[PDB]
């Protein structure tokens, strides 16, 4: 009956007190009516009510919509409840540790450590202490760990928590980044004290100033230290880059904003004075004088760290959001259609032509049973809809020995994505995929930087299933990963993205070469912008699948009873559904015509549209350039030859090459001409480009959050594990904590941070964190535990696990690894706790639905169920029902294991030697020489020694030859499709190996119709993975790279050359992948010390024992076949 729309004024909640003017009840008429100025008078808004009520007394229809509006009563609300509800969906607080520990631990016991180095930081403590002393009491952090989620509860102030968050993140950022220049840590302190007062709204207020500061940041320079690469062929996507040398140059980069310097200077100065005016009068003259220091830097020494450090301060507050209703209101208003039908026809024809050329192929299409299990694997946040009638947790759980031991059972349901594979019976058969004004629930996500609220539109299961089948052949070619001068080249959807050198080679090269320019324009809300052209692009999608498809339309509405062509008529028919989400004071629904979100083709649609209007913009930009050439401006002989457009979803880039490089002002003229051409030719139908929004220009290109200037990569980091969102790290196990504690920080140091201070600060809370709760049993782990996971403090940020472990016999370190193993590996009992079918059966046609051809019938291939029943062809779904539900009881299996880990140190358990060091591996006759000692590396933010290692061996390439067993077997599995059985993934292989050792794995899979050679190869890969590190649910799922180890070329290309040729027989793969991995680790460590190995013998007196193994091992494999047991 009423709702509040607020934009700009208070779109994000701010620090206000619940007691000054709570104003228990208020009349909303005080503000204004959004739709009509005339209908706003509250008196008329009441006399109308009176007249209509008197008419109703006689008897009238009295339409409820018109009647209740005129009642002045309806405009009543209580401010306290509104503010509380707004806060309790807006700000999230999960983090890793509660702040009450971080508050005193970093400010009242270890403060002397912080102050002794940087004295400027006393102001933050001054501000915090005065804030606590002045008001008092209102400062509140009572955490409510009711079930497993920490929820803050505000009392005195609404944003009091974020204030503390910012105050702590300021000192965190200043300490870890080792700034070695004056006035820069100063300007950081002033920006921090500006964001101090208003923790969320101030973030957006200073976001403008910070981003425009990051825009130029280097124009007025004196030296730059250009990085030189080999010529790169922009045409072949597979091309790689190798470094060649340096050269010192005084020429400033010729980016944009030299034309609009004043337009941005005034804009940022206005933003800063706006922030200051409401703030505490921080001497604006100092701010205006100091902000001009940021662009008088140079790319030498320790100044490269500053750009990375500045972005970290931008995300000081963590994971705030914006109101959903307000955003959905304005984003749908700033779109203009006014244009010609010729442009619409061009768009339609381009899309239809581009779909037709991709659909026709020989790529196979997976069947429905396979695609169903692929959907569960996707676990899209939108797609997940867990539902379980009742999973009784009758688990007998040991209880705290506060006085006496107790055994108790408490039921619990769901807690994991439940695919409703039971309801697949109905989904496979009767299920119509058409939309008619139905309502679905809507979820929202949050981002760092406080930019705004991102909405996800989940779709029903039938739609997601049907969609995957229709676009499988388009999605595969687009995500080829390996493509060579193919028409697909244009799309970059398939990249690692995890590391920048391999993922986006073109941008770095285009940034150093002077004979090309880069166009990195970005658009406004792209998904909303298509709401006026959706009817045409979707129509083009529809008729593009009618041709190039041999099947014809037959008009069916039931899944599995439809042709590939039939799906298109039903699925691509516009008419989007309606979405219901929860907001303050009510819940609102909407209808979005456009690409939507959870649609099984959003990325394909976005890249098809993005690559379409680019051609039409270039077509007219060519005409404008030709016009300028005939007159006297750009001049003749400045004509491009090859232009390449690369699209990754919404974001896109444009690279043009030249034979003679145009002078500096020519680049400005042509860039301005292009940006003016796109804004009228490719922006008249909703799209909006701004020259001031993208790093358009020369000598520097900017892809998605990774940008490079003068061959120097300027990664943005901005990762915050300490204050994460949508997590339960406070209730995580010790294993998950120690896995997260080591890899996020590794990324932080990799993307620019001093290794010493960051790890010093991290070590200041290792006892305060990792405090497991075991029913009146508290632990406090010390620095030693990080050795077990494979980190050496005295070493670099390198995974020195195996080398430590071998030497982890005399110098302790033999305890922590066993501790983490007993914390994790005993979850294999949870795996061994399979849940049988008992309470319900249903259509149970699923088991008939999923089947794979067999060799040893169903009563063979393993005489004993010890390795037969658990991987049964017949039991496929029995197995995956439990293998899809570890977590919902793994969270409490961790809780019970918390008892066992304490009991290990209580008893004589643990302290035993490991099993890895029992096997004897090593080399003989190693030749060792000095490292190169030169520092030119494209990663200027990292430490000096790491740069020295990189130049000696060069950049890593192909990201596959380097083992990295996390992704090697995944790549093998991807390349192995169409022979694989139905249920297969990394998780299944890893769990099967863990359960069945090295015998049962080979036994079960050798009877599952797979060839021996590649199964043996990926078995070697998986044992290498299991010996590289332990379990860790986070590590095995998805996976995490060793970073520094993947950006240095130590792949098998040269690793083969290092190993001296052997005379004897070819060694088996079970040990070659082990000894070469040991050699790789040895190569990475000695180099940090300063020497390199160029020759190595295999120590064949150990190689013969290794060749003896298979001799009697193959014999065991074949002998058990010889008997029909």
């Amino acid at each position: 009956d009423f709702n509040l729309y607020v934009s700009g004024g208070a779109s994000r909640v701010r620090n206000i007190d619940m007691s000054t003017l709570p104003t228990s009840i208020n009349v909303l008429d005080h503000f204004e009516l959004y739709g009509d100025a005339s209908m706003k008078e509250y008196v008329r808004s009441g006399e109308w009510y009176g007249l209509l009520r008197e008419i109703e007394q006689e008897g009238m229809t009295v339409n409820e919509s018109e009647k209740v509006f005129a009642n002045p009563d309806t405009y009543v609300l209580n401010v306290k409840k509104y503010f509380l509800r707004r806060f309790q969906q807006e700000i999230a607080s999960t983090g890793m540790t509660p702040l009450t520990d971080e508050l005193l631990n970093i400010m009242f016991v270890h403060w002397n450590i912080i102050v002794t180095a940087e004295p400027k930081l006393q102001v933050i403590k001054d501000d915090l202490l005065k804030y606590y002393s002045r008001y008092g009491v209102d400062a509140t952090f009572d955490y409510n760990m009711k079930r497993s989620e920490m929820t803050v509860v505000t009392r005195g102030h609404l944003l009091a928590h974020k204030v503390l968050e910012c105050a702590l993140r300021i000192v965190e950022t200043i300490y870890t980044y080792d700034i070695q220049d004056e006035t820069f840590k100063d300007i950081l302190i002033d920006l921090g004290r500006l964001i101090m007062r208003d923790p969320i709204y101030g973030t957006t207020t200073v976001r403008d100033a910070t981003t425009v500061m990051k825009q130029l940041m280097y124009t007025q320079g004196t030296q730059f230290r250009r990085i030189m690469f080999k010529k790169y062929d922009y045409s072949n996507f597979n091309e790689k880059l190798v470094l060649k040398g340096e050269q010192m140059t005084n020429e400033p980069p010729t980016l944009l904003a030299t034309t609009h310097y004043e337009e941005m200077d005034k804009k940022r100065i206005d933003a800063l004075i706006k922030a200051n005016q409401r703030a505490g009068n921080i001497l604006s003259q100092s701010s205006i004088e100091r902000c001009r220091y940021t662009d008088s830097l140079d790319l030498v020494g320790d100044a490269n760290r500053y750009f990375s450090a500045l972005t970290t301060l931008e995300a000081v507050a963590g994971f705030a959001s914006s109101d959903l209703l307000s955003g959905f209101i304005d984003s749908n208003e700033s779109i203009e259609f006014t244009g010609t039908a010729h442009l619409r026809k061009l768009l339609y024809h381009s899309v239809r032509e581009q779909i037709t050329t991709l659909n026709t192929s020989t790529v196979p299409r997976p069947s429905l049973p396979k695609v169903l299990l692929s959907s569960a694997k996707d676990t899209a946040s939108a797609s997940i809809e867990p539902l379980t009638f009742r999973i009784y947790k009758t688990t007998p759980e040991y209880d705290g020995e506060s006085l006496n031991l107790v055994e108790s059972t408490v039921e619990m349901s769901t807690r994991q994505k439940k695919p409703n594979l039971m309801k697949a019976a109905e989904i496979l058969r009767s299920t119509v995929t058409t939309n008619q004004e139905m309502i679905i629930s809507g979820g929202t996500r949050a981002v760092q930087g406080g930019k705004g609220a991102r909405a996800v539109y989940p779709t029903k299961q039938p739609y997601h299933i049907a969609g995957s089948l229709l676009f499988h052949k388009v999605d595969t070619i687009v995500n080829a990963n390996k493509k060579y001068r193919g028409v697909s080249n244009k799309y970059g959807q398939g990249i690692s993205n995890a590391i920048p050198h391999i993922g986006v080679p073109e941008i770095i090269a285009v940034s150093s070469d002077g004979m090309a320019i880069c166009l990195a324009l970005d658009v406004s809300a792209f998904d909303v912008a298509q709401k006026y052209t959706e009817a045409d692009i979707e129509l083009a999608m529809r008729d593009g699948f009618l041709d190039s498809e041999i099947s014809m339309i037959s008009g069916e509405t039931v899944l599995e009873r439809m042709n590939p062509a039939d799906l298109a008529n039903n699925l691509l028919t516009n008419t989007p559904p309606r979405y219901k989400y929860q907001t303050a004071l009510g819940d609102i629904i909407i209808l979005q015509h456009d690409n939507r979100s959870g649609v099984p083709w959003t990325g394909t649609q976005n890249d098809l549209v993005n690559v379409s209007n680019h051609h039409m913009a270039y077509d007219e930009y060519k005409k404008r350039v030709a016009e300028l050439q005939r007159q006297g401006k750009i001049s003749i002989d400045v004509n491009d030859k090859h232009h390449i457009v690369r699209v990754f979803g919404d974001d896109s880039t444009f690279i043009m090459t030249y034979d003679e490089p145009p002078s500096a002002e020519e680049v400005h003229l042509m860039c301005a001409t292009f940006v003016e051409s796109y804004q009228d030719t490719a922006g008249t139908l909703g799209f909006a480009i701004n020259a001031r929004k993208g790093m358009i220009g020369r000598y520097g290109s900017e892809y998605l959050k990774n940008s490079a200037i003068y061959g120097n990569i300027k990664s943005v980091n901005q990762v915050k594990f300490r204050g994460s969102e949508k997590s339960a790290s406070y209730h995580f196990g010790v294993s998950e904590k120690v896995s997260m504690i080591r890899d996020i920080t590794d990324l932080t140091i990799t993307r620019g941070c001093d290794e010493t201070r960051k790890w010093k600060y991290n070590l200041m809370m290792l006892p305060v964190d990792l405090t497991t709760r075991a029913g009146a049993f508290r632990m406090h782990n010390l620095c030693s535990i990080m050795t077990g996971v494979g980190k050496m403090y005295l070493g670099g940020t390198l995974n020195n696990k195996l080398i430590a472990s071998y030497h982890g016999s005399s110098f302790g370190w033999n305890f922590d690894d066993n501790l983490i193993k007993t914390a994790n590996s005993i979850g294999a009992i949870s795996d061994s706790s399979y849940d049988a079918i008992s309470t319900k059966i249903t259509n149970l046609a699923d088991f008939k639905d999923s089947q794979q051809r067999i060799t040893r019938d169903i009563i063979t291939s393993g005489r004993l169920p010890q390795h037969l029943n658990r991987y049964g062809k017949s039991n496929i779904l029995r197995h995956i029902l439990a293998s899809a539900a570890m977590g919902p009881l793994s969270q409490i299996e961790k809780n019970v294991n918390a008892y066992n880990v304490v009991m290990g140190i209580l008893n004589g358990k643990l302290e035993a030697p490991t099993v890895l060091e029992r096997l004897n591996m090593g080399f003989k006759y190693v030749v060792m020489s000095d490292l190169k000692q030169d520092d030119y590396s494209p990663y200027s933010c990292q430490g000096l020694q790491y740069r020295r290692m990189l130049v000696h061996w060069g950049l890593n390439d192909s990201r596959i030859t380097s083992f990295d067993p996390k992704g090697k077997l995944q790549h093998l599995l991807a390349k192995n499709s169409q022979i694989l059985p139905i249920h297969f993934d990394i998780e299944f292989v890893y769990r099967l190996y863990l359960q069945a050792g090295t015998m049962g794995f080979l036994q079960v899979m050798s009877y599952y119709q797979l060839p021996d050679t590649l199964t043996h190869e990926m078995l070697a890969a998986v044992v290498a993975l299991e010996l590289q590190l332990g379990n860790d649910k986070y590590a095995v799922d998805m996976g995490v790279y060793s970073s520094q180890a993947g950006q240095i070329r130590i792949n098998d290309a040269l690793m083969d050359s290092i190993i001296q040729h052997r005379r004897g027989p070819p060694l088996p793969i079970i040990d070659r992948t082990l000894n070469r991995l040991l050699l790789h680790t040895y190569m990475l460590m000695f180099g940090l010390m300063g020497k390199s190995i160029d020759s190595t013998k295999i120590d064949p007196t150990l190689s013969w024992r290794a060749i003896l193994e298979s001799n009697d091992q193959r014999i065991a494999q074949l002998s058990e076949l010889l008997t029909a047991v």
Partner: protein, 794 residues
């Protein structure tokens, strides 16, 4: 700014909807309409039939004042109006009195004779003659012959009933009777023609009762035989391909895993030993089986659209290429491949078994012009006592399904090497013995590997019933004359080697779930949509001279408009999509020329084409009934002709000889004032252009002074309607002299008059009766429930 996407409908739905209704087989009763007469009598034994306008349309040609165009426009529009009232009707119903012990069946069909007493003021003497008129209009029966040589020659019984009215009424009724009863026939001839057309004894048509034999039915102008389908050949290939595409919804291929397992059991080599034949078929999928099956069926039907294989090699070979070529050689029959494909695969096979010849030289020497002889001599070399490689072949099947259709069918090849028994068919011999192994730049194939390959490519022997039902429904539903059509779209006959090899390895066959009736209905729809345009062209455009085959391309846009309009008439959608999809291979010009040839060969234009021509003469003859006249005369001081004073007291009719006539109106309108006064001073002046004139007949009781002839506003402008006034002389006042005051007291100095006028006078009341013809439903009743086959007897 808003668009709604329309979901397309399946082909079967459109075909079913097209046959739902709108068919011209069943007729219905109808009766003649009466036209206004308004007759009167001035004195004894004279009766006047005043012509009264009967159709107010017609519009003047502003250009050239052409006379032929005006009449043609009037006649055409009036005919199109009339033909909408007898769409599916024949005149049978009429008003009789009785036939009971009195005089025989008499009729009262025109206006009642009783009203004539008041309408004509008869005296006592002439009233006695009305009963004899009423009692003397008996009904006469006769016969007529309908039907052409192509149909039967039936006889029907017709009545001829008198009625009272005008002669113009009689001629209009005669024209309607002629137009309504073209292409009529009886049931007893339709049945005979139908059983003659369906020669299958298994199908028997419902026998006719004795009361249904003389029933009357409407047949088509010209039957549709093989001749119409024979002229379809330039574009028949597209229709065949789309028909096969629309009714082959699936394929019965065995899964590849079973084939791999069957191969594994046959190979004698160890599991650990690597063998290339086993490792080559593993890189195959069956996901393109439907397309290859459709193409193979099309190649089986038309012997010109042989499959052309596209290979991924240029000079060198590869392990997969050899095994795929062997699979094609041993599985795909040779009658379904072009000569080039046969030669290519034969050369690939022969390059390994030859002692000295290689691949590159054996392709660089031979020429693609005469590859057939090379293929033949290579095949002979592979059938000697040193080498024996069987080559898959096929034969012709003539099996026909029982269904009602109008066109002959023929023989097609089969898309599989089976001969109705599980054993396959080979051209040379069913044995695999070779002198040595296979070697060509490496890639040796062991001796027994070929023997193993032969043992797996065998048909499952179980699916034979399904494997033949589709061939049954496909042989007997495609006209035979299309089998010689050429190929107009190359991509419909091009497949890659891997797809063909995968298709042949699994032994797939086309399969379907539809029946035979749907396909024949679709073919009938095609024929109907071609015949519609054929007769439209033959009735509108067909003209030998005057822009025939030599005209500017500008004029083609005018001609194409009618065909485009007809191709969008809710039921012709099958041809329209084919046209708009394959324009670039078959452009509009040749299609239009082919349609012109089809229409010119032989085709009934329409019953209306001759009807308008016959009606134009009637329009010419009597202008008054159609509300127009020509050559009005302007004069002052006119004179009467004294020849119509016997009927009217005063009339606008004069007899002055014209002088200095004006070409046409709008020239007198704008000439000048006091300049046209000199024209009228010298004498009468005549205006030639035809006008839209309405006559008003009044009695001697009142006046209607419209008189809008001439308006003076600084000129003498003629009007556009020119209504005239008559006064009737009746028996009530015929000896009275009208003063002729109101006629001139309401007109002006310049008078407008009419030169000629037509009326019919009669001397005896007997001459007021005319005749019309009917159908006599008593002996030749209208038919219902057309001829049908027997099924669901209960």
């Amino acid at each position: 700014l808003d668009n709604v996407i329309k979901q397309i409908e399946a082909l079967s739905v459109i075909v079913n909807r097209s046959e739902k209704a709108d068919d011209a087989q069943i007729l219905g009763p109808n009766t003649y309409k009466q036209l206004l007469e308004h007759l009167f009598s001035p004195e004894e034994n004279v009766y006047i039939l005043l012509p009264i306008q009967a159709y107010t349309g017609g519009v003047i040609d502003r250009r050239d004042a052409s006379f032929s165009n005006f009449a043609y426009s009037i006649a055409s529009k009036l005919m199109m109006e009339l033909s909408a009232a007898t769409h599916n009707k024949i005149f049978t119903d009429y008003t009789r009195i009785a036939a009971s012990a009195l005089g025989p069946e008499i009729s009262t069909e025109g206006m009642p004779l009783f009203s004539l007493i008041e309408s004509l003021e008869l005296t006592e003497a002439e009233t006695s003659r009305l009963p004899v008129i009423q009692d003397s209009m008996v009904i006469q029966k006769s016969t007529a012959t309908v039907g052409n040589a192509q149909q039967g020659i039936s006889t029907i019984n017709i009545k001829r009933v008198p009625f009272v009215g005008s002669a113009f009424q009689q001629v209009i009724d005669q024209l309607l009777w002629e137009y309504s009863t073209t292409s009529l026939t009886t049931k007893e001839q339709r049945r005979q023609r139908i059983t003659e057309m369906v020669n299958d004894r298994r199908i028997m048509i419902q026998k006719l009762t004795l009361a249904e034999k003389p029933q009357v039915m409407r047949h088509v102008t010209t039957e549709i035989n093989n001749d119409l389908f024979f002229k379809m050949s330039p574009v028949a290939q597209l229709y065949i391909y789309h028909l096969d595409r629309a009714f082959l919804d699936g394929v019965g291929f065995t899964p590849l895993a079973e084939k791999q397992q069957q191969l594994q059991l046959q190979l004698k080599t160890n599991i650990l030993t690597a063998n290339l034949i086993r490792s080559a078929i593993n890189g195959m999928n069956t996901e393109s089986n439907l397309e290859v099956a459709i193409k193979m069926m099309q190649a089986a039907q038309l012997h010109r659209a042989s499959i052309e294989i596209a290979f991924p090699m240029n000079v060198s070979l590869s392990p997969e290429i050899i095994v795929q070529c062997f699979i094609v050689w041993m599985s795909i029959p040779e009658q379904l491949l072009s000569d080039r494909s046969n030669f290519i695969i034969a050369a690939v096979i022969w390059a390994g078994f030859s002692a000295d010849d290689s691949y590159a030289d054996i392709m660089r020497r031979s020429a693609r012009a005469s590859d057939r002889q090379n293929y033949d001599i290579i095949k002979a070399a592979l059938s000697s006592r040193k080498f024996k490689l069987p080559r898959a072949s096929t034969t012709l099947f003539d099996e026909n399904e029982p269904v009602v259709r109008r066109y002959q069918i023929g023989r097609v090849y089969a898309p599989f090497p089976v001969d109705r028994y599980g054993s396959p068919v080979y051209s040379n011999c069913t044995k695999v013995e070779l002198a040595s192994d296979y070697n060509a730049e490496g890639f040796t194939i062991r001796k027994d590997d070929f023997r193993a390959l032969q043992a797996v490519l065998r048909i499952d022997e179980d699916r034979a019933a399904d494997m033949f039902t589709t061939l049954r429904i496909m042989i007997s539903s495609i006209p035979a004359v299309w089998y010689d059509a050429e190929v107009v779209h190359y991509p419909h006959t091009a497949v890659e080697l891997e797809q063909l090899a995968a298709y042949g390895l699994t032994g797939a066959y086309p399969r379907t779930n539809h029946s035979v009736d749907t396909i024949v209905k679709t073919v009938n729809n095609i024929s109907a949509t071609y015949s519609t345009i054929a007769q439209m062209l033959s009735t509108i455009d067909l003209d030998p001279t005057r822009y025939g085959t030599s005209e500017s391309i500008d004029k083609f846009k005018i001609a194409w408009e009618n065909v485009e309009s007809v191709l969008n008439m809710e039921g012709n959608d099958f041809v329209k999509t084919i046209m708009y999809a394959y324009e670039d291979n078959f452009p509009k010009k040749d299609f239009y020329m082919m349609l012109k040839q089809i229409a010119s060969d032989g085709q009934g234009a329409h019953p209306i084409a001759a009807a308008i021509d016959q009606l134009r003469t009637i329009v010419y003859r009597e202008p008054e009934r159609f509300g127009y006249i020509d050559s009005v005369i302007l004069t002052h001081n006119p004179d009467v002709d004294t020849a119509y004073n016997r009927f009217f007291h005063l009339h606008p009719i004069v007899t002055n000889q014209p002088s200095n006539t004006i070409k046409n109106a709008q020239l007198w309108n704008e000439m000048r004032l006091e300049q046209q006064v000199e024209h009228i001073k010298a004498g009468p002046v005549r205006i030639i252009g035809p006008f839209h004139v309405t006559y008003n007949y009044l009695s001697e009781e009142e006046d209607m002074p419209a008189t809008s002839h001439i308006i003076m506003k600084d000129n003498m402008i003629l009007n556009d309607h020119l209504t005239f006034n008559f006064v009737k002389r009746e028996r009530r006042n015929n000896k009275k002299r009208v003063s002729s005051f109101r006629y001139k007291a309401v007109e002006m100095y310049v008078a407008v008059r009419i030169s000629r006028f037509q009326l019919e006078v009669l001397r005896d009341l007997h001459d007021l009766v005319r005749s019309r013809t009917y159908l006599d439903v008593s002996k030749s009743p209208l038919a219902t429930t057309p001829i049908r086959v027997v099924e669901y007897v209960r």
